[PDB]
Write a protein that binds this ligand. Structure first.
Ligand SMILES: N[C@@H](Cc1c[nH]c[nH+]1)C(=O)O
Length: 238
């Protein structure tokens, strides 16, 4: 009893995973994986754009059926929703101006302005560890606003998923005077283990379907043909 139309929510401001091209078409590795999986599940899928913090609200409100939006599988989100198996890995890393002395430490960030996406694992992390100790953590509705405020000099640093910062901003004309500041921030409690399709706990059949289609496209070389369109490194991880 899979639905005949599966409505997938995504926040289209996170290139290379989910964004809009020049005519408003949804494009990116998340879109490609979702379309390919829908194909193999034999269901129709509609893509719905939403701000990132409304996506899990909308899933439990039954406005959408699935989330494919670089959604990290974390212990916390698992108490509310279910996930497919890992779609790819995602570590977090800071970016700041090239030649910034900044490092992901409280010592370095006290009194700095740090942007984080509202609702992400990075907002949770920075709120707890940095906002409480006086770092000025600013939560934004979408990641594009973050990159603009950074280039505008309103933010001193931004914390987000490393591949999205790299391919989505640092390798773009706008990110040439910026760079990663320090190494990847690793915290198992906060950042979870890779990303996955987010689903209602009770939609067990839909979870089995996405997982099966995912095993199949990985098994026949499609995942690697698809990822090579975006990445020259092993995006899936372990
Ligand atoms: N992976 C992080 C960051 C993110 C995903 N999408 C947009 N931002 C999360 O799931 O919160």
């Amino acid at each position: 009893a899979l639905p005949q139309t599966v409505r997938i929510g995504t926040d289209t401001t996170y290139a290379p995973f989910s964004s809009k091209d020049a005519k408003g078409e949804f494009i990116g590795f998340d879109i490609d994986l979702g379309n390919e999986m829908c194909k193999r599940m034999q269901v129709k899928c509609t893509w719905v754009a939403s701000d990132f913090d409304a996506l899990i609200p909308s899933l439990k409100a039954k406005k959408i059926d699935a989330i494919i939006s670089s959604l990290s599988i974390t212990d916390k989100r698992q108490q509310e929703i279910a996930f497919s198996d890992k779609l790819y890995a995602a570590d977090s890393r800071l970016i700041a101006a090239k030649g910034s002395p900044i490092q992901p430490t409280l010592e370095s960030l006290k009194g700095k302005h740090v942007g984080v996406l509202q609702g992400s694992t990075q907002e949770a992390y920075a709120n707890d560890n940095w906002r409480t100790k006086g770092v000025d953590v600013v939560a934004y509705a979408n990641q594009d606003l973050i990159y603009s405020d950074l280039t505008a000099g309103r933010l001193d640093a931004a914390l987000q998923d490393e591949v999205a910062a790299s391919e989505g901003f640092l390798k773009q004309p706008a990110g040439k005077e910026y760079a990663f500041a320090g190494p990847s921030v690793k915290d198992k409690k906060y950042f979870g283990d890779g990303t996955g399709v987010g689903l209602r706990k009770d939609d067990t059949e839909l979870k089995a379907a996405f997982d099966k289609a995912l095993t199949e496209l990985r098994q026949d070389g499609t995942y690697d043909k698809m990822a090579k369109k975006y990445f020259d490194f092993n995006v899936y991880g372990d």
